[PDB]
Write a protein that binds this ligand. Sequence first.
Ligand SMILES: [Cl-]
Length: 281
Amino acid sequence: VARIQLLNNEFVEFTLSVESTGQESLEAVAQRLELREVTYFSLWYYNKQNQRRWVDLEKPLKKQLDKYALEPTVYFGVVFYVPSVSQLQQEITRYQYYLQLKKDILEGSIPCTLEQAIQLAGLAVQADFGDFDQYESQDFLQKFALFPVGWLQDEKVLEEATQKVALLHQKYRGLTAPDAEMLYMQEVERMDGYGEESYPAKDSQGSDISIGACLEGIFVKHKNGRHPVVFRWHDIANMSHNKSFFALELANKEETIQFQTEDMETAKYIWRLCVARHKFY
Ligand SMILES: [Cl-]
């Protein structure tokens, strides 16, 4: 018996056969949610080094969890981030996407100042609880996750910010939940780090780098103080892996750029996800 953790802090148990693929589990989650735009979403697990890894949806799920996972839990989530949530057509799709974006914020995976957090929390509170005066006090706000890694904030800062959220909340009276969610996602959309996943590596000259995927293409960051380089999706002719190396074949001069990742299994994984993102964009 395995577990699928959903985007709203609920879970589903399920019996894992030997042959059932990751795709089959994803489709079952989608039927459960009545989600009709499933292409943006997939399933991930924590690997044996506690790193997040998206499931190979083509392969049987159970072998993947046995071989690479610490425990038989997968997480439902957005694997293909969209430049504009307005391209999501249906309310159920937007709501799931909203839950993911709120998660990205509350976990700190999209960095966020406290003032940005207060503005986002005001919209989330309107979306999640509706108009402020249905609740004869806002003392319930004190016991909810409102802010990124909020439990680590000083109590006085936390009290003050929660009071600001309560006041922002009153200003949003009359906003429906779909509209409040869209306004929330529209803000998160424009924040640095939205849609980004990255991995440690070295470039062909031994320097340490972070490499990964963003909306625009494959990015590389060095730790000097300069600026990241982005290989735009359409400037990328092909991608490959061999041993621990992951490679981009660029369209301009057929130049091939190598990157050395932690091991051969990591290079294959990075390759698989980056190929899939290239195809999606
Ligand atoms: Cl994928």
